[PDB]
């Protein structure tokens, strides 16, 4: 879910970049390393605001290697869900065990035990989909999934959701 | 590239055809239709906004 947060990072600048243009190198390093990353403490790093207003701190030369470490604070827009969240998304792949829904930059999987029995798997259809009396769900179909759990690793967060209750499926 | 130009000319032609049919039907039934049967769907509720929607159609086409 999109939110604005205050973030900080420690960046090490190599001694070979020690010149009058160090601020430019720091800005390039920050933009090239932070944007698009994922942190389990704050979710995916989507965007950074006020690029011209980057805050900086005085260097502190490490005693072992000579690389100057800097502390940079900024404000960023990030995405992270919570337990019990309901989100609309796009069907990615269809399987017999369930389905996968892309929401934002993340994937939420639903197992066949997590939908009502009225939705039946049709493999002969192109592409294979889930068909019911009222709702049909397939590729590029907007589907609402109630996220139940999330697993966070260094570079990504996976999710598992359920649509077992009513008012779920095609919109 | 050239294929994109092909596609663009495709929506160009279909848009011409669709807007042509739209202006044709609008001007032909510009004479408002009153039919007692429920099947017909022609509504003229507010008198002058009808003319406003007409000039809307004109400017759009």
């Amino acid at each position: 879910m999109f939110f604005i947060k205050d973030l900080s990072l420690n960046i090490t600048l190599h001694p070979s970049f020690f010149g009058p243009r160090m601020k430019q190198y720091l800005k390039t390093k920050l933009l090239e390393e932070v944007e698009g990353s994922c942190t389990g403490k704050f979710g995916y790093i989507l965007c950074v605001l006020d690029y011209d207003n980057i805050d900086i701190q005085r260097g502190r030369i490490l005693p072992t290697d000579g690389s100057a470490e800097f502390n940079v604070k900024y404000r960023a827009v990030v995405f992270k869900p919570f337990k019990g969240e309901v989100v609309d998304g796009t069907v990615v792949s269809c399987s017999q065990h369930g389905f996968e829904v892309q929401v934002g930059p993340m994937k939420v999987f639903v197992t066949k035990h997590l939908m009502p029995q009225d939705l039946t798997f049709n493999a002969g259809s192109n592409p294979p989909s889930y068909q019911s009396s009222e709702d049909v769900i397939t590729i590029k179909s907007r589907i609402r999934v109630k996220i139940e759990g999330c697993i966070s690793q260094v570079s990504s967060i996976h999710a598992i959701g359920s649509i077992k209750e009513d008012y779920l499926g095609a919109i | 590239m050239s294929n994109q130009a092909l596609y663009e000319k495709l929506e160009q032609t279909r848009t011409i055809l669709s807007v042509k049919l739209a202006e044709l039907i609008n001007m032909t039934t510009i004479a408002d239709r009153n039919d007692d049967d429920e099947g017909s769907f022609a509504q003229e509720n507010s008198e002058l906004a009808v003319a406003t929607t007409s000039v809307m159609m004109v400017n759009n086409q």
Binding site: - | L24, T28, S46, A49, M56
Partner: protein, 136 residues
């Protein structure tokens, strides 16, 4: 009240769009043609939506009866009350449709049905013309 509330919000956004197009036309320098087209089309389709929604809920607006507040003082705000009370059209539009009707000027009914048959015939003719050539 729900219908008038929807009318209120939609007309408020229409007035906001009018204020927008106003303060981007008031500049001494005219912007690019394309931005003007985008603003024109958006505001004009919004006016269409205004007309359609006002059409939809005529019964709720008609059922409502206008009455001044007991707390509202008319002695001091009679000018403001009269400002909103008045509804007569601007004169130029009035003589506009007067000249329009002047120019336009059982017989009328049979011309009306003749117009019906011309309309239906033209619609069928253009359907046939469209079907004649493969456009896909």
């Amino acid at each position: 009240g729900q219908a008038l509330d929807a009318v209120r919000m939609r007309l408020a956004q229409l007035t906001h769009s009018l204020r927008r197009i106003r303060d981007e036309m008031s500049k001494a320098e005219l912007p690019q043609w394309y931005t003007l087209q985008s603003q024109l089309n958006v505001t004009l389709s919004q006016l269409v939506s205004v007309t359609s929604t006002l059409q939809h809920f005529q019964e709720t607006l008609d059922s409502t009866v206008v009455y001044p507040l007991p707390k509202f003082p008319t002695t001091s705000h009679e000018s403001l009350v009269t400002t909103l009370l008045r509804k007569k059209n601007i004169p130029e539009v009035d003589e506009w449709m007067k000249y329009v009707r002047e120019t336009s000027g059982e017989e009328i009914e049979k011309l009306l049905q003749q117009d019906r048959e011309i309309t239906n015939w033209a619609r069928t003719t253009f359907r046939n013309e469209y079907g004649k050539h493969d456009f896909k």
